């Protein structure tokens, strides 16, 4: 009826008017997404009480776990989540850097629109300041790596990735990842993140863990074969039991004399299926399902090493390692769906029998980090720290450039951008000045999580950078609000990880600010 809905004319979608500030609703959409991860940044950040959709409880503080479980529905806030998945590509750090800096970009952009600045002019000042931010970032590089492929160089530089993923394991996790990547580091240009597979066994704690070469499974060998150098690996996801035909196959039992005939016939058919693997020359059989007791007798008869893997995630790891495809039928004697491995043997680590899949005539790039833990909740948090620890050094196969962290490269970048924004004439000096103040929220998020007043830390950082004392970052202490040198403490992040993080967070401010209306459409 009269009066009609102003500007809402497309499928009843809520189109806010000019007084209702339709562009301001997208700013509040990315503000609520940034506020869930603002207090989660840093080593003093708070954990998140994760309740999964399969009714499983989790306590973790990873930035990727928050975005995957908290199902966002606002598509204006989905531009940063799609940019955070772009942050997961080509680097393994900066997922919180995208959510905080682009969230502080749009929060400072709302103060510019309240004066009366156009959205087409502010967005041109962000792309100007983004190109100016890409020039000072090579100039902020203090030191670089030594490129000697030793344990001491890797473990000293890995202390940044272990920080804020799992606090307290700074001395343990820095040496466990360091023993794995140095086996792939002679292979120049071949360091890959999928080569390092993580396995977890329920044990005592972190200090009982160890590093092994090749593919290591926690399940022991079901057979009595200890070591065999057979290349043919036939993986079967079906359980070892009686043969059920794909045809009709009606088995009739009436009296007890037919009970002993068909039970012996199932044992004879189980003997024929193990013999169907023995003629093709395959002495390595991995069983996906359960193994019967009579099938264990046929394993030691033909001297075939039988191992049982119940989990499907570890069975899929062998499909992309040796090329063996899991067959659902009861052991089909084919050769094309098999794998290739030089030697497989059974060994013990920490009084636990594990099976090793390594290669001696091939160079070898598969490594397995056997993790031990009492609780499965905290053990999964260390498992994600391995993936964010290896991907921290997967980018170091490129040009090794290191920048100081902890607000050292944040205030120094905010100082030189404001100097470029002060001398720049025209109305575009307002957007560059707010691009520098968006860089101050990340040391503000680091100081507020440590129980320290944020304005006292920022003025302490701007006093030492005005005198030229570079590489000064936040001192992690709730009682001491002072600062410390970052080159002496050992915090050095990646230059390429800081390059894509400012680039993707600025383009997230480009994509959201270009959208000023949301319309639902029917196909």
């Amino acid at each position: 009826k009269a009066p009609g809905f102003a500007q809402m004319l497309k499928e009843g979608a809520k189109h806010f008017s000019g007084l209702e500030e339709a562009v301001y609703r997208n700013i509040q959409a990315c503000k609520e997404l940034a506020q869930t991860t603002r207090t989660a940044y840093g080593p003093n950040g708070m954990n998140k009480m994760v309740i999964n959709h399969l009714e499983k409880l989790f306590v973790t503080n990873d930035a990727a776990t928050i975005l995957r479980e908290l199902e966002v529905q606002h598509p204006a806030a989905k531009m940063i989540v799609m940019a955070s998945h772009m942050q997961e590509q080509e680097v393994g750090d900066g997922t919180n850097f995208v959510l905080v800096f682009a969230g502080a970009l749009l929060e400072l952009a709302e103060e510019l629109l309240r004066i009366g600045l156009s959205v087409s002019e502010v967005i041109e000042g962000y792309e100007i300041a983004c190109r100016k931010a890409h020039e000072i970032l090579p100039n902020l590089v203090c030191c670089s790596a030594k490129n000697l492929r030793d344990i001491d160089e890797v473990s000293s530089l890995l202390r940044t990735s272990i920080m804020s993923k799992q606090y307290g394991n700074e001395v343990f996790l820095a040496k466990l990842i360091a023993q794995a990547c140095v086996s792939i580091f002679p292979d120049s240009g071949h360091f890959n993140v999928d080569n390092i597979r993580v396995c977890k066994i329920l044990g005592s704690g972190i200090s009982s863990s160890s590093v092994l070469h090749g593919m290591v499974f926690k399940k022991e060998t079901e057979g009595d074969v200890t070591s065999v150098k057979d290349a043919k690996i036939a993986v079967y996801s079906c359980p070892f039991d009686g043969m059920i035909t794909e045809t009709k196959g009606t088995v009739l039992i009436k009296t007890a004399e037919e009970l002993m005939n068909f039970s012996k016939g199932e044992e004879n058919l189980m003997d024929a299926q193990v013999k169907a693997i023995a003629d093709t020359g395959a002495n390595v059989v991995v069983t996906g399902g359960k193994v019967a007791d009579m099938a264990l007798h046929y394993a030691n008869k033909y001297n075939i090493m039988l191992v049982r893997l119940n989990s499907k995630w570890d069975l899929r790891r062998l499909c992309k390692t040796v090329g063996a495809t899991a067959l659902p039928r009861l052991t089909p004697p084919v050769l094309e769906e098999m794998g290739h491995c030089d030697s497989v043997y059974l060994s013990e680590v920490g009084d636990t029998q594990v099976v090793v899949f390594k290669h001696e005539k091939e160079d070898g790039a598969i490594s397995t980090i056997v993790l031990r833990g009492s609780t499965d909740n905290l053990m999964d948090d260390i498992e994600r720290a391995v993936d964010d620890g290896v991907n921290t050094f997967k980018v170091l196969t490129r040009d090794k450039r290191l920048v100081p962290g902890g607000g050292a490269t944040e205030i120094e970048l905010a100082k030189q951008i404001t100097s470029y924004g002060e001398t720049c004439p025209g109305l575009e000096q307002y957007a560059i000045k707010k691009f520098a103040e968006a860089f101050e929220a990340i040391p503000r998020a680091l100081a507020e999580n440590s129980g320290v007043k944020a304005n006292e830390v920022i003025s302490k950082l701007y006093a030492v950078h005005q005198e030229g004392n570079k590489n000064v970052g936040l001192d992690i202490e709730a009682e001491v609000p002072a600062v410390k040198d970052m080159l002496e403490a050992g915090i050095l992040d990646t230059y390429l990880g800081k390059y894509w993080a400012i680039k993707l967070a600025t383009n997230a401010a480009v994509t959201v600010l270009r959208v000023d209306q949301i319309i639902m459409a029917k196909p």
């Binding site: 500007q7 809402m8 004319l9 497309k10 598509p75 156009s118 087409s120 319309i519």
Partner: protein, 521 residues
């Protein structure tokens, strides 16, 4: 005077409904005009999110709520078919035509008198349009500035330079010696795992399914192309026979006897390879669309023959035009007269899949434009930007007359319609006066999207007067009156010809309605 199961508006308020409905649609589409405009969001309901600025996607695929605004959405479906350009600017004319006509209806004027002035002002603006257009010959310099006008509105000013050279060289290679241009000759392909600035041109054709064998050549300098449509896998019988066997073990032997009709045709491919250019530094490529058995692939891959399978029907049509090979439907009639040839046949690998290329041809009559992007919504937006960019350069070569952009035509057309005496009626000048201010909404809203003042921009471009030909337009960066013919802001003549024709027809039919009633609703 009304019946139930109906709703009839008897007074003159039914005219105020359709005027205020188009005035509401004007304020929606006025924020996305020009390169300084914003974008809109497409919510499919399931999760598919797209951002487009094209007025066809904002009206045809985009669904409406008001029934009166559904008629204007069908106008952009007719506008995209004839010229493919100007659907955002078409709604802004009708949005101010019915708003300006509402001032005279409140004074008691009939809508028939106002819609007669729109026909008189149409022919005056159309006769003025023949003196504004420039009949200069097209070249590389002008077609870039035509591409810089259309592509810069769907681009965030980072992909403007790398997409301009792609749409110019593709059109100039498919049109020469006054032949009619076909937009279906350009193949649009999409690729992931790269940046958005990696959009380049491919001389040949990108095929989806490639060869799956470790012994395949990664790059072939020269190879003979053989087009087939017969499956080289295990098929049924060809002669009057059947499936006769003694047991289940005998059935595998008759399949081998059935494969003898198939494997004989595989050996004829090797026979045509060795005799016809089977020396060193030579190759062979099979582009058979149907499936080929991997046992037959083992004998072909060892001889250096790159055999492909599982292609599309749209891909096989361009393969016959690129190499010139006749599609073979029977291997018994195999002859080298149906053999084609191509240049560098190589298979560039990506992060996920592999795709082959048949580039470096003399005249394949098919140019494939390969788009690369990291997202799905960015991959669709650049594809929407190319098809909007390919249509603006297509109209420039067929119709050699081009007009200056940046509102320079509509400002000069507003001067001609104001300085015009009534020739058909006395009261018809009130429709001419409303049509004179209707063309002024295009430099009016271009100042709002750029952030400048609406009245400071309109006055300064209207005060530009001299004793010579002068067409001035708007400047989105400075705000000063800028000559659009000098800086390189150019539009097509067919865009402005359909802008004057479609606006005087549709805004007539909205003004000529009297009552709105439900016929079964």
């Amino acid at each position: 005077t009304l019946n139930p199961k109906a709703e009839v508006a008897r007074a003159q308020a039914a005219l105020a409904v359709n005027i205020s409905a188009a005035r509401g649609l004007q304020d929606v589409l006025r924020t996305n005009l020009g390169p300084k405009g914003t974008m809109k969001m497409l919510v499919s309901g399931a999760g598919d999110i797209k951002l487009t600025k094209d007025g066809n996607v904002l009206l045809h695929e985009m669904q409406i709520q008001h029934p009166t605004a559904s008629l204007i959405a069908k106008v952009a479906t007719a506008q995209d078919d004839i010229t493919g350009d100007g659907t955002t600017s078409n709604v802004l004319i009708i949005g101010e035509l019915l708003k300006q006509a509402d001032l005279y209806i409140s004074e008691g004027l009939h809508p028939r008198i106002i819609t007669e002035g729109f026909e008189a002002a149409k022919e005056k603006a159309l006769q003025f349009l023949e003196e504004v257009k420039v009949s200069r010959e097209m070249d590389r310099e002008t077609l870039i500035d035509v591409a810089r006008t259309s592509l810069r509105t769907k681009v965030h000013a980072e992909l403007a330079d790398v997409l301009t050279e792609a749409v110019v060289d593709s059109i100039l290679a498919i049109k020469k010696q006054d032949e009619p241009i076909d937009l279906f000759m350009i193949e649009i392909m999409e690729m992931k795992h790269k940046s958005e600035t990696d959009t380049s041109l491919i001389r040949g054709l990108v095929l989806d399914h490639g060869a799956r064998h470790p012994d395949m050549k990664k790059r072939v300098e020269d190879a003979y192309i053989l087009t087939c449509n017969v499956s080289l896998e295990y098929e049924k019988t060809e002669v009057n026979s059947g499936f006769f066997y003694k047991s289940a073990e005998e059935r595998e032997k008759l399949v081998k006897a059935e494969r003898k009709f198939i494997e004989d045709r595989v050996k004829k491919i090797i026979e045509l390879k060795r005799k016809v250019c089977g020396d060193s530094d030579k190759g062979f490529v099979v582009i058979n669309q149907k499936g080929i058995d991997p046992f037959s692939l083992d004998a072909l891959s060892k001889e250096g023959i790159v055999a492909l399978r599982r292609a599309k029907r749209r891909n096989m049509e361009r393969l016959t035009l690129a190499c010139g090979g006749v599609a073979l439907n029977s291997f018994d009639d195999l002859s080298p007269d149906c053999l084609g040839h191509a240049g560098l046949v190589y298979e560039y690998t990506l992060g996920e899949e592999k795709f082959t290329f048949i580039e470096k041809c003399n005249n394949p009559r098919s140019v494939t434009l390969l788009i690369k992007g990291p997202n799905k919504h960015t991959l669709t937006q650049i594809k929407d930007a190319v098809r909007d960019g390919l249509r603006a350069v297509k109209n420039a070569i067929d119709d050699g007359c081009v007009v200056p952009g940046a509102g320079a035509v509509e400002v000069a057309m507003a001067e001609a319609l104001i300085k015009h005496k009534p020739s058909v009626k006395g009261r018809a000048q009130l429709g001419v006066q409303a049509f004179a201010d209707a063309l002024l909404i295009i430099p009016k809203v271009l100042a709002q999207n750029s952030g400048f003042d609406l009245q400071e921009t309109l006055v300064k471009i209207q005060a530009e007067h001299s004793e010579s030909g002068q067409l001035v337009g708007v400047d989105l960066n400075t705000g000063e009156p800028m000559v659009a013919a000098e800086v390189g802001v150019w539009d097509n003549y067919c865009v402005k010809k359909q802008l004057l024709h479609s606006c005087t027809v549709i805004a007539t039919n909205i003004l000529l309605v009297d009552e709105i009633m439900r016929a079964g609703m």
